[PDB]
Design a protein around this ligand. Structure first.
Ligand SMILES: *[C@@H]1O[C@H](CO)[C@@H](O[C@@H]2O[C@H](CO)[C@@H](O[C@@H]3O[C@H](CO)[C@@H](O)[C@H](O)[C@@H]3O)[C@H](O)[C@H]2NC(C)=O)[C@H](O)[C@H]1NC(C)=O
Ligand SMILES: *[C@@H]1O[C@H](CO)[C@@H](O[C@@H]2O[C@H](CO)[C@@H](O[C@@H]3O[C@H](CO)[C@@H](O)[C@H](O)[C@@H]3O)[C@H](O)[C@H]2NC(C)=O)[C@H](O)[C@H]1NC(C)=O
Ligand SMILES: *[C@@H]1O[C@H](CO[C@@H]2O[C@@H](C)[C@@H](O)[C@@H](O)[C@@H]2O)[C@@H](O[C@@H]2O[C@H](CO)[C@@H](O)[C@H](O)[C@H]2NC(C)=O)[C@H](O)[C@H]1NC(C)=O
Ligand SMILES: *[C@@H]1O[C@H](CO[C@@H]2O[C@@H](C)[C@@H](O)[C@@H](O)[C@@H]2O)[C@@H](O[C@@H]2O[C@H](CO)[C@@H](O)[C@H](O)[C@H]2NC(C)=O)[C@H](O)[C@H]1NC(C)=O
Ligand SMILES: *[C@@H]1O[C@H](CO[C@@H]2O[C@@H](C)[C@@H](O)[C@@H](O)[C@@H]2O)[C@@H](O[C@@H]2O[C@H](CO)[C@@H](O)[C@H](O)[C@H]2NC(C)=O)[C@H](O)[C@H]1NC(C)=O
Ligand SMILES: *[C@@H]1O[C@H](CO[C@@H]2O[C@@H](C)[C@@H](O)[C@@H](O)[C@@H]2O)[C@@H](O[C@@H]2O[C@H](CO)[C@@H](O)[C@H](O)[C@H]2NC(C)=O)[C@H](O)[C@H]1NC(C)=O
Ligand SMILES: *[C@@H]1O[C@H](CO)[C@@H](O[C@@H]2O[C@H](CO)[C@@H](O)[C@H](O)[C@H]2NC(C)=O)[C@H](O)[C@H]1NC(C)=O
Ligand SMILES: *[C@@H]1O[C@H](CO)[C@@H](O[C@@H]2O[C@H](CO)[C@@H](O)[C@H](O)[C@H]2NC(C)=O)[C@H](O)[C@H]1NC(C)=O
Ligand SMILES: *[C@@H]1O[C@H](CO[C@@H]2O[C@@H](C)[C@@H](O)[C@@H](O)[C@@H]2O)[C@@H](O)[C@H](O)[C@H]1NC(C)=O
Ligand SMILES: *[C@@H]1O[C@H](CO[C@@H]2O[C@@H](C)[C@@H](O)[C@@H](O)[C@@H]2O)[C@@H](O)[C@H](O)[C@H]1NC(C)=O
Ligand code: NAG
Ligand code: NAG
Ligand code: NAG
Ligand code: NAG
Lengths: 562, 21, 30, 30, 21, 562, 30, 30
């Protein structure tokens, strides 16, 4: 009970529905399911075709260019939970390029654990606005929906009356349904994790989404964490072992799994049947236990791997030594950084080089946690052990307080890094200790960090004069070592009722400094009474090709008028 | 030249003593 | 200013690439 | 036969016109 | 991969015959 | 007569007026005159000081930081003509940093032949708007006037009545004078070259500016071209020889000039006493005649010369072989190109490299006329035989129809060349024949030529539909080899009553081309009747790091409405 | 857009340089 | 004595304060 069917690990079906009868009886498929590329199908090829047995899928689900199909309500009436270990560009549901697919009817779907949903190029699909993803998913901001029949606003995706919850989200009540028949089920604000029953009572604390009886671990529908023999359990009691984050197996099971590659031979650690041990650990001929020892090399294919998503990431989960090179390239739009961090470089070494190209949303590099050493035994072409280009939000590389970096060979290469100011670049040169290598134009001295004044120098206001209609500031006249390079004073002002954060001024005559009576100012007229303003001033100076004198800026301050 | 010594570097009194006669 | 959409088009292109890259070589084994 | 660079649904239709019958299996290991 | 042959280069009928079975 | 004084070749006066009595008697100074750096002077040190003898100066005149002096009307009451062979950053008159200098009174100045006038940092000078430079100079657009007492508008620089010509130039009549006494003399519109006399009759056809009697070569004031013994002459009769573009000398003169370096030893060619012979020529022990022979190396100092003006240029006048390297660097603002052309590279070879850095107004390189060969035996650092950077108007390098180029070693290096499209760059690679050398980022593939769509591809309009209020164009749907790279259609339209020369359109669906019914269009509404418009369309596509498919543009066309 | 004035300031600076470069070494000959 | 980079009229005044008397001649050849 709770799963009368079988496992039937994931296999994918092509070109006709003949192999689909291999996947009839099974209750929960381990792995993934893809149905793709069936052109010669008919709508009649699905009315005699249904699978209520399938309830939960571990990893992901994909639909791609199968003709004649218009719905999914018959094929998968009872699919409920997607866990999403192996993802698909941080998705698990791929609804894509499906000609004639006009509805889904996936009402029994309740929770998708990890991943997102991408829907594209499906010019028949409607009923899409009636789908509250936030009930089913957490990060609704990673769901991409375009090129659909809804995108030319035609479909009256309604239900006859009350039933379907009309929930305000953005402007007004959004009726929530799947078909014109099937509503979207809403559990109350207390049965949220484990799900609710029909009348709305909470399920058992080990249920998930649906339960056949309220508060019963023997009468759930889907387990929250783990399954053991009619009871969803919080953990494995001995002598049982966790396997693939959903069940408890005995020693004999995962034991005899090892004996079949004679491919993922398995071992046991931390009461969990696992593929491999991390570093410092050992096999066991007795029981395949990760016993510690003295002294993990994830040797790539061709010493090189493009990394672009979680699907790229989890191949490097738990690695310690990378015998190759890495190309980080996320044409993205969404910060993967936490999920990026959670399966990345608990490492120190890279044998080859490192390359970061054209990635958009990488604001940092701190997800590299333990990284210390770059061997660089195979360089980037042009003799580089490191690279950067076109990183529209990258500001911090690391905090160099505790983070260290050791680089053997190669050079640095920075271009078009518009929020990466040169200060941390020279700091990275310093901590790297390879400052005697970089030639001219290894650093783009015109594009790096050219969207915020950064570096060191600070303006300080000497005198402040206010009125109801007058503002006069006085500040120390800064002069760079070439006093001709000063061009003028960039002043930035606005009002601010919060504190949560344009005129120009010619420089005065330097001429001396025993008594340089040259404290510059600007009179403001555009004042409102009793009104909080926000003003800060920046130094606008001449660019020079050499190590340019960085120029100053002032603090953002706050002034309230009469 | 001039800015090579008094602007790029900083001149000394002894360097400008060459610019006395 | 609006260049994020200009990259977003390429994001769509990369997504188009990856699925075809899945479809392409499971067949040549000879 | 076209002599042209291909992507997208153009490449999809080209692949379908080449394959016709069975074309492509999915047994990398089994 | 795919765009390395049918987009970067141009595929042949014989190259895609490997993508027949 | 015509020059009763002497020559007294140019010597410059410093630190006190003691050496000024060396230059009393002389009528026309050959060379240049600089007065500079007299701090301990008094206004009384000039009332007992005058030189009416000086009339014409060959090369240039410079005034720089002399105190106590307020005028020039007594020092030089009769200076009249500046010829300007050796110039001073394309100037011959340097009025600069003169404390207490409040007027000029240079009424007897009539014509400045070659060069310009720069006035700066003279916070006492006025009477400046009353000076028509176009009477005295040709290129008035090369005269830089700033930081003066006129720049804080105070001086009433007037004359009591009529006298001084009140000439409209820009808005109204500009009274023309030097002092409150001395008007600015205007000759009529027929005596313009040689000058006029007091009543306004034309002078002789060999006079210049002033003449003591109307139409008399024996009673001029200053020669137009050449001087010979009370008569300004068009040329030297034999046995006389031209010398420094102003006189005629016998064989004995320039003969005995040679005998004094035992520094510019002289020779004779083309009836002109000259410094040296050009290539293929020989000395003569008999008469120092440039006789031709079989088989000119201007060997630099340190193999290197910054070139920035005509003063830099004329050191390389007439050279044929440059045993060094050249740095072209004109922070400019004015096209020197014709004067640049007229004394430059009638050459073929450069032993070292070539460098062009940060020059502004160099639109071309065609002033390099005969240039063929770059040896490059000493490279630019980073292994380059060539360079470019920051050339805000450089578009054409050459016409490669007849112009050739041979490069031995080194590489090319292009950055920030915003009107230099890559087509001619690859053409220069082709003609150079050194295409198998340039690495990645030897060409900045993001900044070069990024201010005008250039390269090759051309849109063509198929169908045109008009009305009094409707405009619909149809044109051939271009598709780059990646059809996904097309993003949209940039359309540029405006009205044009002359013919002397913004909306966007999504791409339609490609999907095939047996019958690609995808001719794109745009309907216009903003039409005026009977009205000539000007429309052209550009292809807005995706950038790629590789050899990008260049994209197209349309012709500028002309459409008149109903 | 208005960067020609930004170079024009440096043009003034270069002109300031050249005259000083004339003034500087006619004196050290020793 | 200042320890500072110098240009312009600052450098002019510094040169004048150093030189005082004669300071600088103009005989490169004669
Ligand atoms: C769908 O069901 C899950 C089952 O609990 C709901 O909770 C989510 O559970 C996962 C797994 O326990 C949590 O992920 C974990 O995050 C921690 C860091 O906080 C990480 O260390 C673990 O390795 C694991 O990845 C997740 O945070 C948790 N989310 C919430 C909001 O509790 C999930 O909420 C259900 N979905 C919906 C829409 O209700
Ligand atoms: C000031 O006097 C001169 C004396 O003729 C006036 O004419 C200018 O004369 C010079 C020398 O003859 C001309 O320059 C020449 O240009 C040719 C190219 O056209 C070049 O091959 C020669 O080597 C020489 O450089 C100049 O063109 C000529 N200008 C005019 C307008 O005739 C001059 O006009 C007088 N200035 C004023 C303001 O009247
Ligand atoms: C789906 O299940 C039916 C039901 O039989 C069950 O599954 C069998 C694999 C076996 O374990 C039975 O003991 C179960 O009760 C399968 O139909 C049976 O197929 C077998 C051959 O495999 C045949 O000998 C039986 O007579 C069939 N019984 C019935 C009632 O039809 C079917 O094969 C299963 N499909 C798949 C793909 O596994
Ligand atoms: C150790 O476990 C094995 C396997 O467990 C079976 O498969 C799991 C996925 C789960 O469904 C368990 O409930 C299953 O028992 C046991 O081998 C099976 O034992 C059952 C006994 O009811 C028997 O019906 C099956 O035929 C057995 N499988 C095979 C392939 O013969 C084994 O009994 C367990 N041993 C102990 C001591 O618990
Ligand atoms: C400027 O000219 C006067 C006038 O004398 C003429 O120039 C002389 C150089 C000489 O060539 C005379 O024959 C000319 O008549 C010069 O005053 C004369 O100076 C000389 C000494 O050089 C002296 O013997 C005469 O007596 C002076 N005569 C008079 C009338 O004063 C003066 O020296 C010339 N200045 C310069 C710098 O050459
Ligand atoms: C050849 O020319 C020389 C030099 O000419 C003199 O200098 C010129 C710049 C110009 O001013 C001419 O008028 C000059 O004559 C002659 O040498 C001079 O001749 C004059 C004759 O009147 C005499 O007074 C000078 O003292 C001479 N110069 C010297 C230094 O003694 C020479 O006579 C000319 N020979 C012929 C044949 O014409
Ligand atoms: C990059 O640097 C390496 C290191 O010097 C250069 O590779 C050497 O090339 C020479 C001859 O080509 C060989 O004898 C060495 O064994 C090479 N060393 C290594 C470590 O490869 C290479 O030429 C340089 N490339 C560029 C473009 O500068
Ligand atoms: C530029 O290229 C030259 C040519 O190879 C390099 O100079 C050589 O350096 C080696 C050892 O340093 C010497 O044995 C050769 O004699 C040099 N040749 C010449 C022509 O100078 C130089 O190292 C290269 N520089 C860079 C920055 O790449
Ligand atoms: C990496 O950095 C760790 C922290 O550095 C410590 O604190 C900073 C402020 C410095 O004072 C540094 O010298 C200290 O050691 C170290 O614990 C660790 O040893 C470092 N590892 C390497 C290889 O340098
Ligand atoms: C330089 O170029 C001159 C003109 O080139 C001629 O015309 C063009 C259209 C080509 O057909 C070219 O091959 C012709 O020679 C030549 O007269 C001259 O020889 C060239 N000099 C060198 C060194 O190549
Ligand atoms: C929340 C939910 O869908 N619960 C379902 C219920 O709808 C269905 O009627 C029952 C079997 O009849 O199984 C359970
Ligand atoms: C045009 C011009 O200035 N001509 C002058 C005239 O003014 C002066 O009176 C004369 C000598 O008295 O010499 C000549
Ligand atoms: C279904 O597809 C498989 C493989 O493509 C093929 O062997 C089988 O004949 C097909 N069946 C039908 C009915 O087309
Ligand atoms: C004028 O200057 C020269 C050289 O600088 C010097 O010989 C002479 O004594 C000075 N005369 C006066 C009065 O300062």
């Amino acid at each position: 009970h709770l799963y009368p069917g079988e496992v039937c690990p994931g296999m994918d079906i092509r070109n006709n529905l003949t192999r689909l009868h291999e996947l009839e009886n099974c209750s929960v498929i381990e792995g993934h399911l893809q149905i793709l590329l069936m052109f010669k199908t008919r709508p009649e090829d699905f009315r005699d075709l249904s699978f209520p047995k399938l309830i939960m899928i571990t990893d992901y689900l994909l639909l791609f260019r199968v003709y004649g199909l218009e719905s999914l309500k018959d094929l998968f009436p009872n699919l409920t939970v997607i866990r999403g270990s192996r993802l698909f560009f941080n998705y698990a549901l791929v609804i894509f390029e499906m000609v004639h697919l006009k509805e889904l009817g996936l009402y029994n779907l309740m929770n998708i654990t990890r991943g997102s949903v991408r829907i594209e190029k499906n010019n028949e699909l409607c009923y899409l606005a009636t789908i509250d993803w936030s009930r089913i998913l957490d990060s609704v901001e990673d769901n991409h929906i375009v090129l659909n029949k809804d995108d030319n606003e035609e479909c009256g995706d309604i239900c006859p009356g009350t039933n379907c919850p009309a929930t305000v989200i953005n402007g007004q009540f959004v009726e929530r349904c799947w078909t014109h028949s099937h509503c979207q089920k809403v559990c109350p604000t207390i049965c949220k994790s484990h799900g609710c029953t029909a009348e709305g009572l909470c399920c058992h604390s080990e249920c998930l989404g649906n339960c056949s009886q309220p508060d019963d671990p023997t009468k759930c529908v889907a387990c929250r964490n783990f399954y053991l023999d009619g009871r969803c359990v919080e953990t494995c009691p001995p002598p049982y072992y966790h396997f693939q984050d959903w069940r408890c197996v005995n020693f004999s099971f995962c034991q005899d799994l090892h004996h079949k590659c004679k491919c993922h031979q398995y071992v046991i650690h931390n009461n969990k049947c696992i593929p491999e041990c991390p570093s410092g650990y050992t096999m066991n001929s007795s029981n395949l236990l990760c016993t510690p020892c003295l002294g993990k090399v994830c040797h790539l294919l061709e010493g090189e791997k493009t990394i672009d998503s979680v699907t790229s990431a989890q191949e490097l989960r738990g690695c310690t030594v990378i015998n190759g090179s890495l190309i980080i390239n996320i044409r993205g739009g969404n910060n993967l950084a936490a999920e990026l961090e959670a399966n990345l470089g608990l490492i120190e070494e890279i044998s080859g080089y490192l390359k970061i190209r054209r990635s958009y949303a990488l604001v940092s590099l701190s997800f590299f946690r333990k990284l210390r050493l770059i061997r660089g035994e195979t360089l980037e072409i042009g003799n580089y052990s490191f690279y950067a280009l076109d990183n529209q939000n990258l500001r911090q590389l690391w905090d160099w307080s505790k983070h260290n970096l050791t680089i053997t060979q190669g050079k640095l290469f920075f271009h078009y890094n518009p929020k990466l100011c040169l200060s941390e670049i020279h700091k990275m040169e310093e901590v790297s200790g390879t400052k005697g290598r970089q030639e001219r134009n290894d650093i783009a001295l015109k594009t790096n960090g050219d969207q915020a004044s950064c570096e060191n120098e600070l303006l300080k206001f000497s005198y402040i004069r206010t009125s109801f209609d007058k503002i006069l500031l006085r500040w120390e006249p800064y002069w760079p070592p070439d006093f001709r390079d000063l061009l003028g004073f960039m002043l930035f002002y606005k009002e601010a009722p919060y504190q949560n954060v344009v005129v120009d001024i010619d420089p005065p005559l330097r001429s001396n400094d025993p008594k340089s009576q040259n404290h510059p100012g600007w009179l403001m007229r555009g004042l409102k009474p009793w009104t909080q303003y926000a003003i800060f001033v920046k130094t606008l100076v001449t660019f020079s090709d050499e190590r340019r004198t960085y120029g100053a800026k002032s603090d953002i301050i706050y002034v309230q008028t009469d | 030249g001039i800015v090579e010594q008094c602007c790029t570097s900083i001149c000394s009194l002894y360097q400008l003593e060459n610019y006395c006669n | 200013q609006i260049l994020k959409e200009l990259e977003e088009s390429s994001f769509r292109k990369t997504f188009e690439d990856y699925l075809h890259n899945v479809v392409f070589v499971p067949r040549p084994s000879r | 036969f076209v002599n042209q660079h291909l992507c997208g649904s153009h490449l999809v239709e080209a692949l379908y016109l080449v394959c016709g019958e069975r074309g492509f299996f999915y047994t990398p290991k089994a």
